[PDB]
Structure 1
């Protein structure tokens, strides 16, 4: 099954955050399944599921592992305040559309 491993956990309280690198080990699976992985990270730490994000997923040749960048928050308010809009329209709840002209 899908197993997770955090490494190099640092605390950035200036952005009120804790950021780390994620080894995602999936044997005979398709790939990471980012949402289910975020639920697993929400479970392995304190919950904050709409405050946790992972973005830097790179699989390796032949499968097996993937390396990404995880960053858990406290306080979904500052998750909205600091996590940028493109990641928020990917995962969270902000959405911005533009008047495309010219």
Structure 2
């Protein structure tokens, strides 16, 4: 079976989340996927698993020790407020515009070459 243990647990009233360090013990099996830690923390702290953010899981040498972090929020919109965008992209909550940097820089320069209202139609 797979069990986890918390470490360095603390609460943050001024940022509306809780920090912890997760020590995953999986002898024999491989590293468990992050949805397992999310649902285990959901049924451990009696919380809906939509506010469980875990990352930074590195497997130790020896086959069975895994150290990672975990954020336990108290709300979904509060988790939407103070969070980097890539974690919300990982949970399928946020989407990014798919434009490379070279096109944006060239479009900025082409808009810089012309004045007036024509900046709207020089860069599509």
TM over 0.5: yes
Report the Cα distance in structure 2 between the residues aligned to 1:67 and 1:97, rounded to whole angstroms: 33
- 3-state SS of paired residue (1:61): coil
TM-score by length of 2: 0.76
For these two proteins, the number of residue pairs brought into alignment is: 102
- TM-score w.r.t. the length of structure 1 is 0.92
Residue 8 (str. 1) matches residue 35 (str. 2) = no
Which protein is richer in helix relative to its size? Answer: 2
Q: Going by fraction, where is strand more abundant, 1 or 2?
A: 1
Secondary structure of 1:66's counterpart equals: strand
Structure 1 segments, 4+ long, off by >4 Å, are: none
Give 3-state SS (helix, strand or coil) of 2:23's partner.
strand
Post-superposition offset of 1:36: 1.4
Q: Where does structure 1 lack aligned partners over 5 or more consecutive residues?
A: none
Residue 97 of structure 1: how far off its partner (Å): 2.3
Identify unmatched segments of 5+ residues in structure 2: 103-124
Distance 2:30 2:65 in 1: 11
More RCO (CA 8 Å, sep 6+) = 1
Answer yes or no: is the 8 Å Cα contact 1:48–1:76 preserved in 2. no
